Amino acid sequence: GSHSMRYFYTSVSRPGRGEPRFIAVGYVDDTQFVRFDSDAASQRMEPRAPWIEQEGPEYWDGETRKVKAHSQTHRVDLGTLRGYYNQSEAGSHTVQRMYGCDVGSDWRFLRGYHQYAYDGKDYIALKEDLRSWTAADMAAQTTKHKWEAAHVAEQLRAYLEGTCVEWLRRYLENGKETLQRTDAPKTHMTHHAVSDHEATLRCWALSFYPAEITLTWQRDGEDQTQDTELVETRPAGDGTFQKWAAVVVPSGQEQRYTCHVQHEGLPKPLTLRWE
């Protein structure tokens, strides 16, 4: 039962159309709880979960100040990277930043993450030892030199082993009713004849939380991938998730195939057979 807290920032330049569009989102595991949009009228960090509204004005003022700072630094980074790659002002470019921390089922610190990307492409990242940086190209090398000079790694490690984990624990306790719950996947199977000699078996897992789930197909008890098809886990919209896995079988041999479901909300993984 590990948990995580994650902050995502996206900044998209709009040449000739004003300032860059900035969107920030905060997640605890698979639940979004804060949000900032530079095109919104509020100009403040806004709640997205009910358990974060307990925080007083000091928390929201501080959060709004830091999200403004992230917006400003991203805007400056856009022009800086435009200079690093000798790019003109005609093109629209995107800078993304993500950072956060993981804790185990004991809520002990596991790992911290801090990384950037430019135009959909990896740029710089904190290494696993939380002591150094990995640069994806030779401009990120200059960024890494700047960050090593300023000893950014130590301040970041202090944040990741301190404020990040402590406030993740605080949110998991204040939102205990929804962050620490586990919704088992409600499963069911569908049958559809595709021809006179073949059919399609689709097993569904619905209304589960968290999003991590495993759906596998077995024929005669052996893993099968030949005529199988899985969809990406998708949000239902009410806070839970959905997924299904299908397989094409010879009509009349449905009993040879089983669908195996693995999730945190189920003590024993489920086995679904058509009949």
Binding site: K66, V76, Y99, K146, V152, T163
Partner: peptide
């Protein structure tokens, strides 16, 4: 809670 430092590429 977010990070305090004013970081630039």
């Amino acid at each position: 809670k977010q990070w305090l430092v004013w970081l630039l590429l």
